[PDB]
């Protein structure tokens, strides 16, 4: 809807790239300015980009399973960088193995993530949520 800016990438030692390209394509198609930092990205690159570009949200993708380690501490660091209240989304395959989804969702919300997505989430769900959260729907 409106020309909002998001930061998009894949965190930690994760090289999975196909979803990242689809996400970029879909969010771009939806009207967003996508700052795509790509794969194998540590937390600091998400924050640097968000500042540089005055992003409205950071979409963290995590597929390879070690997101439960990699995703800890992002909110704190965003706050310290002066990005208090920015929207924080995380999706993909964020934990190792099949688990009970509600327990997982809680776990990442407890880390400071605004929204948490399960395996196989269509981009259209995240686009709709983000338009809502940004009051542009």
């Amino acid at each position: 809807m409106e020309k909002k800016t998001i930061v998009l990438g894949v965190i930690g030692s994760d090289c999975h790239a196909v979803g990242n390209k689809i996400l970029d394509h879909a969010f771009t198609n939806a009207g967003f300015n996508v700052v795509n930092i790509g794969v194998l990205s540590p937390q600091e690159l998400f924050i640097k980009a968000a500042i540089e570009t005055k992003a409205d949200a950071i979409l963290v993708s995590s597929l390879y399973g070690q997101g439960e380690i990699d995703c800890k501490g992002l909110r704190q660091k965003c706050d310290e960088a002066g990005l208090e209240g920015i929207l924080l989304y995380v999706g993909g395959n964020i934990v190792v193995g099949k688990q009970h989804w509600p327990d997982v969702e809680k776990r990442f919300k407890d880390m400071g993530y605004d929204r948490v997505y399960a395996p196989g989430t269509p981009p259209e769900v995240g686009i709709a949520d983000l338009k809502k959260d940004l009051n542009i729907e």
Binding site: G12, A17, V18, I22, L40, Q66, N93, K98
Partner: protein, 483 residues
């Protein structure tokens, strides 16, 4: 070091070894003289290269899963289940992704967190942190050959440790364990570092110790045209043979059209042998690995078995030496031992239901083999030309010029110009050629196959079809038909 496709000398290799072993304190556990004697005491039943010879000789396809967790005892319990309840023919140890970036610090943290949580927070086994000691305990606890399966641009220390650890196969290559797995590693450096890995096996073979090497065929696992995939594997096989490797398994990832896939596996095997002999490597034993569908899976477990077992059927009729097993948990997360064993059992049933059966020759298979060999030769010929006869330098220049281009590869050294898509029978074709050096006749055949899909679907061939093809199996079918 300067990059050349030439066997490193003994002195050369030694000086690199003494550098590499310092990269983590477990490097001190590696003693080459001691390790040769250890390796030679492993029974033939637990030697990967020797069992591969056996499979070939008996005309059977053997089954192997993916598997790995952070802690030593749990990982051994897992492999024992796959062997005993699963019935695996060969065992992996899938190495975690921090290891793959040489972040032994993060591996360390991952082990402590896994200990505290009672579950693995790592997506594999940190072999470097576990050392020779740990790797040998794994091998001594199982009764099948062991292979490191991973995706590591700089695998030099890892190789020293798992091989000294008694693991008698290492997966990977300077191209295949760079472009699908790394963003910032030059093709020259990963080629150089994989020369090490190959040269270590060459040392071992010179001592009478047989160790397998397996270039990673499927690459990004996402619509890779057989000819591009095969050119990579043939290249990695040649670069390995130059450093003294003698037992090589070249691989390919399922595209889904049975005739296309069998053509690819046969062309891969045939051209690997041909090229080896043309360049004077006359004592290399070549086998093949077929990987079950490496793209997105359906979440429904029954549907997942549909993918797993159709893929196995293709492998069996293709005459593959080995097949890598997927599980009904693929769309969701790393499989429990039960789900893994389930995938192995379905796979092995399919193989035994097809004992000795092979796809016979037809005009159709003949034609597709001809197309794939000619495409593949276009790429290799250009590589040798750019390198003025040196295939290692030719490989660097080819990535620089887009002559070799891997779909969806995250490497910044990958052009990202070529675009693949399925034709109306589900065969992966070239949509956009980029700088892939094909003749007009070869591009025209690709266009002709694809126009039949446009006609059937009533829409122009496009990137939207590629997107649809990327999601199609997870949505229930091979070809991304509209709706």
């Amino acid at each position: 070091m300067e990059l050349k496709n030439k066997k490193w000398t003994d002195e050369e290799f030694h000086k690199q070894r003494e550098e590499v072993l310092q990269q983590w304190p477990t490097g001190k556990e590696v003693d080459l003289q001691e390790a040769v004697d250890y390796l030679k005491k492993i029974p033939a039943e637990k030697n990967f290269a020797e069992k591969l010879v056996l499979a070939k000789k008996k005309g059977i396809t053997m089954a192997q899963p993916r598997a790995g967790v952070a802690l030593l005892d749990e990982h051994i319990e897992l492999l024992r289940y796959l062997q005993d309840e699963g019935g695996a023919d060969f065992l992996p140890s899938t190495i975690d992704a921090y290891t793959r970036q040489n972040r032994y610090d993060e591996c360390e943290n991952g082990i402590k967190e896994s200990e505290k949580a009672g579950r693995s927070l790592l997506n594999g086994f940190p072999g470097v942190n576990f050392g020779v000691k740990g790797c040998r305990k794994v091998l001594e606890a199982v009764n099948l050959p062991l292979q490191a399966r991973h995706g590591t641009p700089d695998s030099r220390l890892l190789a020293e440790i798992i091989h000294a650890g008694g693991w008698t196969s290492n997966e990977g290559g300077g191209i295949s364990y760079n472009v699908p797995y790394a963003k910032n590693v030059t093709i020259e450096k990963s080629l150089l570092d994989w020369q090490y890995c190959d040269r270590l096996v060459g040392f071992y073979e010179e001592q009478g110790v047989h160790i397998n090497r397996e270039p990673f065929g499927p690459l990004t696992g996402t619509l890779v045209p057989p000819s591009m995939s095969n050119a990579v594997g043939i290249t990695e096989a040649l670069l390995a043979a130059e450093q003294g490797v003698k037992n090589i398994t070249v691989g390919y990832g399922e595209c889904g059209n049975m005739i296309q896939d069998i053509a690819a596996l046969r062309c891969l095997e045939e051209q690997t042998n041909e090229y080896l002999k043309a360049y004077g490597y006359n004592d290399v034993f070549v086998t093949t690995v077929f990987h079950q569908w490496m793209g997105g899976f359906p979440q429904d477990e029954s549907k997942a078995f549909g993918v797993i077992v159709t893929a196995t059927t293709i492998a069996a009729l293709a005459g593959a030496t080995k097949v890598i097993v997927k599980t009904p948990h693929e769309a969701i997360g790393i499989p429990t031992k039960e789900a893994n064993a389930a995938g192995i059992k379905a796979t092995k049933m399919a193989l035994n239901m097809l004992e000795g059966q092979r796809m016979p020759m037809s005009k159709e298979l003949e034609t597709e083999m001809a197309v794939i060999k000619a495409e593949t030769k276009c790429i290799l010929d250009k590589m040798f030309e750019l390198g003025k006869g040196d295939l290692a330098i030719g490989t660097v220049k080819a990535f620089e010029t887009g002559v070799m281009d891997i779909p969806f590869g995250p490497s910044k050294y990958n052009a990202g110009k070529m675009m693949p898509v399925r034709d109306n029978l589900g065969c992966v074709r070239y949509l956009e050629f980029g700088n892939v050096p094909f003749t007009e006749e070869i591009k025209n055949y690709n266009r002709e196959r694809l126009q039949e899909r446009a006609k059937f679907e009533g829409r122009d061939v496009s990137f939207q079809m590629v997107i649809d093809d990327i999601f199609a199996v997870g949505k229930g079918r091979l070809i991304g038909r509209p709706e």
